[PDB]
Symmetry: D2
Amino acid sequence: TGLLDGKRILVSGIITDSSIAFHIARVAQEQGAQLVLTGFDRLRLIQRITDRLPAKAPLLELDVQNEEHLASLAGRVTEAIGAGNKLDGVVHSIGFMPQTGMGINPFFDAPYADVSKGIHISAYSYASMAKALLPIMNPGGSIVGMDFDPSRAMPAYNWMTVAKSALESVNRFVAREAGKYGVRSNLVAAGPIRTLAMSAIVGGALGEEAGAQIQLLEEGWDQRAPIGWNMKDATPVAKTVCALLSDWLPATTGDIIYADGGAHTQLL
Amino acid sequence: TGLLDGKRILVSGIITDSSIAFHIARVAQEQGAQLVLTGFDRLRLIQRITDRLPAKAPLLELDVQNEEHLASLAGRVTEAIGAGNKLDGVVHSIGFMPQTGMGINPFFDAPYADVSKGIHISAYSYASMAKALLPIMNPGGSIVGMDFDPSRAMPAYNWMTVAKSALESVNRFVAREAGKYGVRSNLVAAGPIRTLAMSAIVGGALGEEAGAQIQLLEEGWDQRAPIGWNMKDATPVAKTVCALLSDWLPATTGDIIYADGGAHTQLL
Amino acid sequence: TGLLDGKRILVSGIITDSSIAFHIARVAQEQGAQLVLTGFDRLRLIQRITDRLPAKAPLLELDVQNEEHLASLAGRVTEAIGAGNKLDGVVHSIGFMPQTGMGINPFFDAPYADVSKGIHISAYSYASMAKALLPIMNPGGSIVGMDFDPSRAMPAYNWMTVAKSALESVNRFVAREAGKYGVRSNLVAAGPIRTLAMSAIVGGALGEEAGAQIQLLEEGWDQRAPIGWNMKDATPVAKTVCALLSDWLPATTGDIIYADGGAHTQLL
Amino acid sequence: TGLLDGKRILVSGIITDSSIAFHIARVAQEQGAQLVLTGFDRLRLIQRITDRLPAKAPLLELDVQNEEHLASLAGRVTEAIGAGNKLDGVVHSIGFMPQTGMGINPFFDAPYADVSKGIHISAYSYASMAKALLPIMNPGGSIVGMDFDPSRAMPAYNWMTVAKSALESVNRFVAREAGKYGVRSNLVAAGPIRTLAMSAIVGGALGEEAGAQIQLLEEGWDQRAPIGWNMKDATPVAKTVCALLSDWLPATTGDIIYADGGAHTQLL
Ligand SMILES: NC(=O)c1ccc[n+]([C@@H]2O[C@H](COP(=O)([O-])OP(=O)(O)OC[C@H]3O[C@@H](n4cnc5c(N)ncnc54)[C@H](O)[C@@H]3O)[C@@H](O)[C@H]2O)c1
Ligand SMILES: NC(=O)c1ccc[n+]([C@@H]2O[C@H](COP(=O)([O-])OP(=O)(O)OC[C@H]3O[C@@H](n4cnc5c(N)ncnc54)[C@H](O)[C@@H]3O)[C@@H](O)[C@H]2O)c1
Ligand SMILES: NC(=O)c1ccc[n+]([C@@H]2O[C@H](COP(=O)([O-])OP(=O)(O)OC[C@H]3O[C@@H](n4cnc5c(N)ncnc54)[C@H](O)[C@@H]3O)[C@@H](O)[C@H]2O)c1
Ligand SMILES: NC(=O)c1ccc[n+]([C@@H]2O[C@H](COP(=O)([O-])OP(=O)(O)OC[C@H]3O[C@@H](n4cnc5c(N)ncnc54)[C@H](O)[C@@H]3O)[C@@H](O)[C@H]2O)c1
Ligand SMILES: Cc1ccccc1Oc1ccc(Cn2cc(C3CC3)nn2)cc1O
Ligand SMILES: Cc1ccccc1Oc1ccc(Cn2cc(C3CC3)nn2)cc1O
Ligand SMILES: Cc1ccccc1Oc1ccc(Cn2cc(C3CC3)nn2)cc1O
Ligand SMILES: Cc1ccccc1Oc1ccc(Cn2cc(C3CC3)nn2)cc1O
Ligand SMILES: Cc1ccccc1Oc1ccc(Cn2cc(C3CC3)nn2)cc1O
Ligand SMILES: [Cl-]
Ligand SMILES: [Cl-]
Ligand SMILES: [Cl-]
Ligand SMILES: [Cl-]
Ligand SMILES: [Cl-]
Ligand SMILES: [Cl-]
Ligand code: NA
């Protein structure tokens, strides 16, 4: 039996088939969920990527900086899943930070206009998605967002670290609001996964130094993780997200589940 | 159907049918697990309690202060589940602290002999159970222990708070050892549940309930929890434990999952 | 002898004589420091307030959203303290959040334009001040910022909680940069102090619920604090800040010192 | 001049002139404090070491496992400082763990008798010292203990990590008791310092693995620390402790100050 049988779940943040969102969606479908997908900017490309999922699913446009998309989202979703039906799950797998706020680019030289855009998309949007979608969410439902442990500073993650620290704070306030609908809000702090963003945005910002990033990642995660960590395998992260969409973590909200091989609990 | 289909799991710490362990066991069985149970001291009584579980399960004696029980445990378990079979899960739901280290008894008046006994049973035993049982645990398996958030001091929990702080530290070292077997070790920080032990904390069971205690708990948990907290319902805690015994939190180890209605993420 | 004898220190964020910054400055002067002050918007008013300090000190205009002020700040400071002299200390005591992001105003109804302004002033500005002033800071020097524990969500603080979570993350990255100059960067997480911002901005946002605020504060701080907490006394906060400006916490950086009566260490 | 002028302070835990306690005591005396010292086992040796302090100070025997010493301590101290006088400060710089609970010795092979002794000395004793001495402590006074960040597991520290996790929990409860006397209780989480215990107890437990591990530590605490870290220099730790004994952190209790160069705030 599907862990998510007859749950209607919204999954944002697919762009390639390496995306964490893609694998969340794949696993969710294997576990009996009906999906609704959202995508940003490259809709024909995303469409061709989502056809590779095990089952057909509607795809809607959502740019989280666009007030009109947010205002119309609930309605467009209602249309896709049929009137008098609702979502049981929502997955926020979205992030962005301009090259100026990342990599070897000095921390101090990122102008606030750039930092602000990143916080808008990576942090604020968790609240605006919640605002838009809670009115069409069943009791017992689950909102989930993706996090990267920002509790200690680190090389290269720079201003995205600050956005994630903001996200953790937003998640806790969303939990309060979501509570009134009988809905949980949580984050998954994933270990590093080889995705588009990782390689092109993050590694891109190191240009010449890009080997250095792999040193940090090997050091901070697989070496520290008591059960190891594999950057080429999003499945453990995807399953962790599905666990939170399920009924099997019913007492957990405003919280962060670490899907990092346990790396964050070990110093060396 | 079963979240735990054909998993062989050991559950310690049943004494009444209010015990967290009893409900862990109940839910695990509903989810297709074959169980082995352990009990302390009152074996005939525990036996009569465990017959009330949905399915028959073998019951072994385990006093975690007794080196001979620990040395023989693996063997006795192997006998119960059949040679060439192994455990996929182990649940530590055990605790004790002498009256001197809890309730209105002044913190400074608890002699070390008493505190030591409590730390032995409540914290050290997590490691000694792990030591005894990992040699008969399959890769992919999960050890789980019960925690009560000791990160801030509080009235009455006194020296048990210290034992729990110790337990959290032990759990992280057990994760390292368990890692070598492909096994996860985690704690569930549960909210308050009306159990035998809980009533023994202030003034011994059989007393009227103890108003100050009940108020503190409602204050610290249901009021703070965005989704509420019900002390008479162990199901949400039991499900959280089963999620960690399952394959759906495969990347999480050395860690603490909060099953507390989200109370620990809200200040008031 | 002055704890801060012959230290040249910059203190931002004075607006009334209740301001935390005013008391930081007062205590610093009592302890032998030469000060340079910065103020926002109401310069004639601030000037009349700073004349009430024990000693004369130059006052400069600094609006942290204004790139020209930031670009010229180092120069204007150098002029005030004399060429070939430098700062040993910098105090960031600055914050802002539009009423939409605070109080009874629904969390989800604060538009990002408003939240962004608050994060700019309350969080980003810590970095931009550091960027501007480190080039004129002696080795052994100390940057300090003011924090309000955002690790758990709470009523009313709303989007300022998010700004503070961001600030904590920024402080850790500023520490890295400051390190290369032999300079420490830390935050003081203060308990509640009756200041202009507290009463007019925060209490203002509750309008008709403003009694609620005083109750929550007494509940979260004085009741929990083992040594008590007095909202009408900024001295303990000011002294804590001076300790970090001094040579007596030389091994502490990227960190948070709690000046809250110990409230954050007790559950209730 | 003195940060600690006319404060009467008790300093435990001197055994060599590399001991953290020795440097705490030295700095405290330079800052105008009258000291009372305590020592374990090797009294003639400790006596010859304490004569190297800048000023004469009485030396008392205290083995924290000995109930008779604890019962008589307050009286013996009163005798040393003169009747009708009291302590303003108490410093716990004490620790022990048998070789079985440390280094390359397997975590699971440390028998509880050994772990218990270490927790007794390293954790419980903080409370028993407090119990014995609070009755002779002035309002405004400060108790301080030494910590090593146990919040993440690590190689070699093993069961001492568990003792430190216990200590942090005890410190929070001692704060509550100390509060009733107007007294603060806090810990200093120090970075690594080359002391007798470090080299003989900890390094001893690595035997063959020893030299490499000391070099790694000096490299990594220092590499992570934005202001660096020098294991041969206890002054920064000693000053941090004096700051807590002083009047300049009056709002901090039940808490942990990190004197680690900021290493704990940086991931790499
Ligand atoms: N890759 C990792 O190692 C890793 C680890 C932890 C957390 N995360 C987080 O996981 C999430 C997914 O990232 P990923 O690595 O799978 O990357 P990805 O780059 O494959 O996906 C990021 C997504 O953000 C979307 N997005 C960007 N701007 C948007 C906007 N304005 N409106 C809507 N969508 C927008 C993109 O369309 C894309 O689908 C992000 O929150 C990221 O921070 C990534
Ligand atoms: N009830 C709650 O509110 C709550 C909440 C969070 C955590 N916990 C923890 O959950 C666990 C179970 O508590 P519970 O309240 O369900 O209690 P309980 O009613 O079962 O009380 C004690 C249990 O520990 C067992 N035990 C005691 N000493 C033992 C020994 N020497 N060897 C083996 N077993 C021994 C007893 O048989 C019994 O099963 C404990 O670790 C407790 O601290 C309880
Ligand atoms: N009062 C409390 O209970 C409390 C508790 C903890 C922390 N804090 C923090 O301490 C700091 C000081 O606040 P306070 O309570 O003393 O308040 P306050 O209202 O007296 O001061 C706020 C200050 O912010 C300044 N400011 C606002 N926008 C600015 C800008 N663009 N550029 C420069 N300065 C600007 C104002 O001029 C004023 O001096 C803030 O960061 C606040 O968040 C306050
Ligand atoms: N050395 C470090 O790197 C470091 C770092 C962080 C914390 N600490 C802590 O600092 C404290 C001092 O350790 P140190 O490194 O300075 O070591 P040290 O061995 O020089 O001093 C430890 C002290 O413990 C005392 N002691 C042991 N058992 C005792 C008992 N039964 N009764 C009384 N005293 C007893 C010894 O007399 C000795 O003075 C300890 O708590 C240690 O864990 C040390
Ligand atoms: C989607 C996204 C946009 C902008 C920045 C990061 C983004 O997602 C992540 C991608 C990879 C990672 C993992 N990662 C972090 C790093 C830091 C360089 C050390 N390298 N990899 C985290 C993310 O949050
Ligand atoms: C098993 C056990 C032994 C001794 C003390 C407590 C024990 O289990 C618990 C039972 C209830 C709780 C919850 N709790 C704590 C309190 C104290 C009032 C704070 N009341 N209930 C925690 C436990 O660890
Ligand atoms: C009475 C009571 C108070 C608090 C929690 C559960 C309670 O009910 C029971 C108490 C004990 C028992 C079984 N039991 C255990 C014991 C020995 C004390 C171990 N005696 N009886 C069953 C209950 O339903
Ligand atoms: C400077 C400032 C601007 C906007 C909002 C708050 C500001 O400073 C603070 C004032 C009071 C406090 C403490 N506080 C918090 C609250 C909320 C009611 C819980 N009331 N006071 C923190 C601040 O950061
Ligand atoms: C006093 C003492 C007794 C038993 C064990 C350690 C003791 O003191 C310490 C000495 C050094 C340190 C710091 N340290 C710990 C480690 C781990 C080996 C990697 N390296 N350095 C901490 C202590 O608590
Ligand atoms: Cl490891
Ligand atoms: Cl997996
Ligand atoms: Cl019996
Ligand atoms: Cl009692
Ligand atoms: Cl109840
Ligand atoms: Cl003596
Ligand atoms: Na460094």
